[PDB]
Design a protein around this ligand. Structure first.
Ligand SMILES: [Mg+2]
Length: 478
């Protein structure tokens, strides 16, 4: 019943000054991008278009029929995320949408449902796969209105951080997969298409069902933790903006936690070898049963490359030199095991599928009537065996919904999105560096152009490098 055609006449004239330039744009705010919305506060989208594109003017190489479409989402924690607005970040500098507008991009910024959202009757409406369905549905809206809306729908660049990086990556990996259509039909998405031109993903929290073994492979033996306390009800912004003041919990892993981490580590080589990932040379990246082999040597080179860039920039590597072989003031070798034992660990095992089903990712895999579920055989079987011994009974997420949240099952040599920029910080312990690396390898092995880097001294977060990011987008757009 909600009409889906874009009205170029229904806008507000807005402006913003970054340091001295006046960026004028036309704002089309809170468009319902779906004919039958279930939650209109979240399933709407803001579209910002530079004012030049209504006066037959150019911004750089870009014009009103030319401009790439910058597609940022605001999701963190797999929580509901509202459409982003044009303004400044906490640093006081231009945020990503303001940056995009100054460079001549059209900005379409969708909101999306998330894991705590309910309907009027209390049923959950934002458990998996709602958020990926909302992002697909907004893309389809962009394609349906391409001919009347300024810009080029064939050049959509997705952006996200953390959980929202996972969705941006998912959006690039599953373009037009049939799995999502019954959900798109149900909410009346436009019947166009949802493949995108390029993905940018900061610290994606993906591959959820394999992120527990990878995290213990990396961090086994680090038995004292410290982390910010996140709860069921932590908002998106607090998951993604680590510059906000939060209280911190710290302690030592219990003996059972250590046995669980021992067992989880044991399980990662079976999984990693199953992927048959090859590096640049066609050399298979594998792991022995002891957890060593070429894949670990591959990871250590990412760190070596990170620390050597830091050196060239005069940054401090001091705290981590004990893991480094340094000769003529270049790092030539990195003992990855030593490197990962340097800080305190962050999450406790199992880091994603907790035994009491209380993680945020547990909460993502609830359904209309269940607030959380398991999604790994490992955590489910522990609880299932305990219930049988008792004569609580655990629930396991639907296999097809676990699939729909994981870009790994969709990346092919035929994946249509060519360009991918992936960042995971060298001191980011919200997930294993093994996980974004595995995503990056899978895309390279499938013939896609991948720009992957672990920036030194960088924890969880996104958009800390907007100048470099839009250099990449400009280059990728050609
Ligand atoms: Mg257009």
């Amino acid at each position: 019943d909600y009409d889906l055609k874009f009205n170029p006449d229904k806008y507000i004239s807005k402006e913003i000054k970054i340091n001295g330039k006046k960026i004028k744009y036309r704002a089309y705010e809170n468009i319902i991008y779906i004919k039958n919305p279930i939650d209109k506060d979240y399933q709407n989208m803001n579209i910002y278009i530079p004012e030049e594109y209504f006066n037959n003017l150019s911004i750089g190489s870009y014009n009103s029929n030319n401009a790439p479409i910058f597609f940022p989402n605001t999701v963190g924690g797999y929580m509901p995320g509202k459409a982003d607005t044009v303004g400044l970040g906490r640093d006081g500098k231009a945020n990503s949408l303001t940056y995009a507008l100054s460079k001549g991009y059209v900005v379409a910024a969708p909101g999306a449902r998330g894991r705590t959202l309910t309907d009027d009757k209390g049923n959950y409406i934002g458990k998996a796969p709602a958020a990926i369905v909302d992002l697909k549905a907004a893309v389809r809206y962009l394609y349906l209105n391409d001919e009347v809306m300024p810009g080029d729908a064939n050049k959509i660049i997705s952006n996200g951080t953390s959980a929202g990086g996972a969705l941006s990556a998912l959006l690039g990996a599953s373009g037009n997969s049939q799995d999502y259509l019954p959900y798109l039909k149900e909410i009346g998405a436009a019947e166009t298409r949802d493949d995108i031109f390029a993905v940018s993903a900061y610290c994606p929290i993906t591959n959820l069902e394999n992120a527990d073994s990878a995290y213990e492979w990396m961090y086994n033996g680090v038995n004292s933790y410290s982390r910010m306390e996140f709860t069921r009800n932590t908002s998106a912004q607090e998951y993604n903006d680590r510059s906000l003041t939060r209280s911190t919990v710290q302690g030592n892993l219990t003996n059972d936690e250590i046995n669980i981490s021992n067992k989880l580590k044991t399980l990662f080589p079976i999984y990693l070898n199953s992927l048959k990932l090859t590096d640049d040379g066609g050399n298979l990246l594998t792991l022995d049963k002891s957890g060593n082999g070429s894949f670990k040597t591959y990871l250590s080179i990412i760190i070596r490359n990170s620390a050597n860039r830091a050196l060239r920039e005069g940054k401090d590597i001091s705290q981590f030199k004990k893991a480094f072989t340094i000769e003529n003031n270049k790092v030539v070798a990195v003992n990855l095991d030593v490197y990962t034992h340097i800080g305190d660990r962050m999450k406790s095992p199992p880091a994603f599928d907790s035994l009491d089903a209380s993680s945020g990712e547990n909460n993502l895999f609830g359904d209309k009537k269940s607030d959380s579920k398991h999604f790994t055989k490992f955590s489910f079987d522990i609880n299932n065996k305990a219930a049988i011994d008792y004569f609580s009974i655990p629930k396991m997420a639907d296999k097809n919904i676990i699939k729909m949240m994981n870009p790994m099952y969709y990346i092919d040599s035929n994946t249509s999105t060519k360009y991918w920029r992936i960042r995971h910080g060298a001191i980011d312990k919200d997930t294993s560096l093994a996980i974004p690396a595995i995503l990056a390898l899978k895309l390279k092995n499938s013939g896609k152009i991948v720009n992957f880097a672990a920036p030194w001294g960088q924890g969880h977060g996104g958009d800390y490098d907007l100048e470099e990011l839009f250099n990449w987008i400009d280059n990728v757009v050609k």
